[PDB]
Design a protein around this nucleic acid. Structure first.
Lengths: 177, 64, 141
RNA sequence: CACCAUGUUCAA
RNA sequence: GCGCGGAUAGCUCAGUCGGUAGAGCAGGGGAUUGAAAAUCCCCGUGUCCUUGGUUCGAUUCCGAGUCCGCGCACCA
RNA sequence: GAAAUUGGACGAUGUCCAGCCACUAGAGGAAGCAAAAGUCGUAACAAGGUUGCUGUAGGUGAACCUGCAGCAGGAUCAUU
RNA sequence: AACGAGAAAUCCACAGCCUGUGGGUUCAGGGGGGAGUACUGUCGCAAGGCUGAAACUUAAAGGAAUUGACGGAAUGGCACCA
RNA sequence: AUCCACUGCAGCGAAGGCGUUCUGCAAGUGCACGUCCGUCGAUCAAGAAUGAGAGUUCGGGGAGCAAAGAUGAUCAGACACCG
RNA sequence: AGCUUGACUGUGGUGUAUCGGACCACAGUGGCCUUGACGGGUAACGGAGAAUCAGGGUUCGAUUCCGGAGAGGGAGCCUGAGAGACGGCUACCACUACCAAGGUGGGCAGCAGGCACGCAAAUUGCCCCAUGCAAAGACAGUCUGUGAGGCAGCGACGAACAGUAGCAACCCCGUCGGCCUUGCCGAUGGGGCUUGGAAUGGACGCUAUCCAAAGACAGCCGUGAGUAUCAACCGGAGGGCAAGUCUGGUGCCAGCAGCUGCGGUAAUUCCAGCUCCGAGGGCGUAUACUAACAUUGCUGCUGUUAAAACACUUGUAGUCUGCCUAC
């Protein structure tokens, strides 16, 4: 009863569930970034929608209003530390050019696939799910991990995994023994 | 129509149908693998003129 | 036209309040006669006893015989006439077999051919009618 | 300006 | 309580009084229709209460006798 | 200092009475609605074969008919 | 007879100034039926007026306009299949 | 009983409605104006007064017309149109 | 549409912890009401809040926090600082349990649990380890209690994150680019089949870790997957609405179908098979409410003919009301 921990929904189902345009575009990006369902897309879309609505309601203000200072500085710092916006495009109008790919490439799967650790994006997702990859020193195992610009240079195989400096897995252990 | 519908005819067609069993069932893709299949079958296997052939194009039958 | 003017709040509110009673949706929601008269006393599903089978001739331009059962409700005694959905399925129903009935997808009105039949059968003897249809489960005894 | 009623069901 | 009527295919029913059988409804098959509906053909189907003498067979003769309706009637 | 005594209050509860509300049985009467192919007419839609309709009154198997007054939403935007 | 308005018919000293929506105020409507019915209240000699639902039923009713068809409507042509 | 023709893209009345002539009675709008008052106004649940025709009530009247009714036709019917 | 007769005020008392018609005695005739009194209804406990929400708003809020009320229905009390207490008492009512028939009892809307009622909701678990509370009480020698509370079990209510496979060789396929008249060759690249080297999670194990004690999680340099049988589904495929003029059966029948419609012997819609589409560890169905809805309109509807201007004036409450007054 008195269990005051919170929970919430991270995505919203689109109206008009059978529109050719949105279906084909969603499937295109799902296949391009190795996604298992449409909710992986709709949660990134909801994050983007929150970011862009905050940006809009901030831009409706002047420059120097306390809301502008605090929340706009926060939005830009967020979109910077997560590699959405670079030092050049660090303004509330460039945060309105955000596209769902701008988060889908920040996604850890795409980053360990672009770093050449994996052959394909599905091979990347398989590695992350099979916990071969560390972000920093921590073994990360969720392919939607949103890799910050800082921890982007510390992605590497894990010392516990055969890929790298670990003991042989099941099949190689057996084949040797 | 010598005789029309009645309560004695419930289940007529379902009881008449010749009961063709189902085939050998090679297991279906689920999730990321099925999204991969669909992305491949649609957006890269693409004859670029007709645009995006429809999936369930069936062979020519009695009606054509 | 409506009264503008900065002191017509009572007139505007009283008029809206007395005029809302012409919205038949609001009217049935707020008029406490549907909880009284409707067989589902404000309820999605009810359980009843199958009293009889009924063949209902479909309305024009259609000419089928829809298979229904006259059901007596356990909670209020009222008699209704639920429809048995799917091919056959009425061979999964005999007299005295307790059955669960829902409305149709129209909140108190009849769908398609069915004249005046506005409920359907979901499960007979505690097992889903569609389960029995696609041979997922078997009827008890 | 005698009187001149009717046309089964769905389908087109 | 005294006394009167008839049961004939699955149902409604006219039956040569004392020579042994029939219609609609009811199902199927066909004709018609684009499919029906109405229609027309063809095909089903009966110990006629339970019985006694049984005219030749008792369905039709009489009497007992289920089932269901009805009139007659006591006075001062 | 107990039981017992007298008695004011609070007041359960029973019975009666009154009002009100809710649910419900009912012979019979009368409506409404629904359901392919039942009956009788043809009232309306054309000047629908008596132009149509409104109010009211009477009559009638049923539609409806008739009177009075009105209307055109008429079949007339029109003749010293 | 313009602009404007309107779904259009049409309106035009308005049915204009209306999504570029606010001068003021009253009454009424919320799909079609059931139904202007039932019950109740009130007025009346009565007929009845005013007031006025619901259960239930249904996917259209409806409005203007168009093209054809029809007319025991009009006008004008015509045919020995009159 | 009713006021033809005149009688109309005429007038009046809040609407219903109002048509022969003379006449009694009170009234309204509009117009004219260096008249008066000085915001006294607009719209209005409740309330009130008028309100065609039909209908009812009490007392008369009754020509014409006319529900009901009678009645002759028409009709398959025709207590309908028509007389 | 009228309501009220302790009803409304006053004076003097009573009572209370205290003000007070709270009660009483005596005086008066007040008090509320179309700005809706009084009455009736509860899809009425109230609020914080919840769901939507351009704006304005709409709907809900038994439920964790606060307030109120109650403890089977009433009522009366004692004790106490505090109760009109109910895991206190007393009585009556309604049910009810034990009996040796004289008597004694009862109160789960506390926690588990059972019967009913229903469309509809869990274990007769362990423990005070944490959070607190109480007490004559820090802890230990020497067990304070705690169904508050915590932890477990059941739990597709509802949320969040992952898996149900990945890489490459063989064989059949397409686009590009060459040679070349088209055809042939190579390169990413995609489908189905065989073969490889790997990878990993579920599941089991550990007294390692966790735990009040266990269980699970995390960890494992512990085993160990090929039809990776350790085998995804729920709805659909005329339109709205993504996806078959496929094949067999049916023949206005069975049935589908929210609406339109489909079915009458060539069914894109039924029953199936194959294929395909959509969401996906979920999907469908029913019900309620929200949005859609400017189809309740304050923003912001409509009223000649679609629904809707009162027959017409008057007229009270209500609403709205001309111009002007300091460099």
């Amino acid at each position: 009863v008195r269990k005051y921990r919170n929970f919430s929904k991270v995505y919203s189902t689109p109206r008009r569930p059978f529109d050719k345009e949105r279906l084909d575009k969603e499937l295109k990006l799902c296949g391009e970034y190795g996604l298992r369902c449409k909710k992986e897309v709709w949660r990134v879309g909801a994050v983007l929608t929150k970011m862009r609505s905050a940006a809009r309601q901030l831009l409706t203000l002047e420059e120097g209003h306390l809301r502008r200072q605090i929340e706009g500085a926060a939005l830009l710092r967020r979109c910077q530390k997560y590699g959405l916006l670079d030092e050049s495009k660090l303004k509330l109008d460039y945060v309105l050019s955000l596209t769902v790919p701008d988060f889908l490439e920040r996604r850890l799967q795409t980053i360990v696939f672009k770093l050449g650790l994996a052959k394909s994006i599905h091979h990347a997702r398989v590695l992350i799910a099979q916990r071969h990859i560390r972000v920093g020193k921590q073994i990360c195992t969720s392919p939607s991990f949103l890799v910050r610009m800082d921890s982007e240079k510390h992605i590497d195989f894990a010392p516990q995994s055969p890929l790298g400096g670990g003991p042989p897995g099941r099949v190689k252990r057996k084949k040797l023994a | 129509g010598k005789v029309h519908g009645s309560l004695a005819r419930a289940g007529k067609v379902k009881g008449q149908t010749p009961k063709v069993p189902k085939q050998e069932k090679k297991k279906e893709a689920v999730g990321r693998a099925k999204k991969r299949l669909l992305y491949n079958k649609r957006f890269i296997s693409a004859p670029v003129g007709g645009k995006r052939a429809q999936p369930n194009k069936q062979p020519a039958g009695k009606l054509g | 036209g409506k009264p503008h003017g900065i002191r017509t709040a009572r007139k505007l509110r009283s008029h809206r309040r007395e005029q809302r009673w012409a919205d038949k949706d609001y009217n049935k929601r707020n008029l406490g006669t549907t909880l009284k008269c409707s067989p589902f006393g404000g309820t999605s599903h009810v359980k009843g006893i199958v009293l009889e089978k009924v063949g209902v001739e479909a309305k024009q331009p259609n000419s089928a015989i829809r298979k229904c059962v006259r059901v007596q409700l356990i909670k209020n005694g009222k008699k209704i006439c639920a429809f048995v959905p799917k091919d056959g399925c009425l061979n999964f129903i005999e007299e005295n077999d307790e059955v669960l009935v829902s409305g149709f997808g129209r909140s108190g009105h009849a769908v398609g051919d069915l004249p005046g039949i506005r409920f359907k059968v979901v499960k007979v003897s505690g097992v889903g009618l569609m389960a029995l249809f696609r041979e997922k489960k078997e009827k008890p005894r």
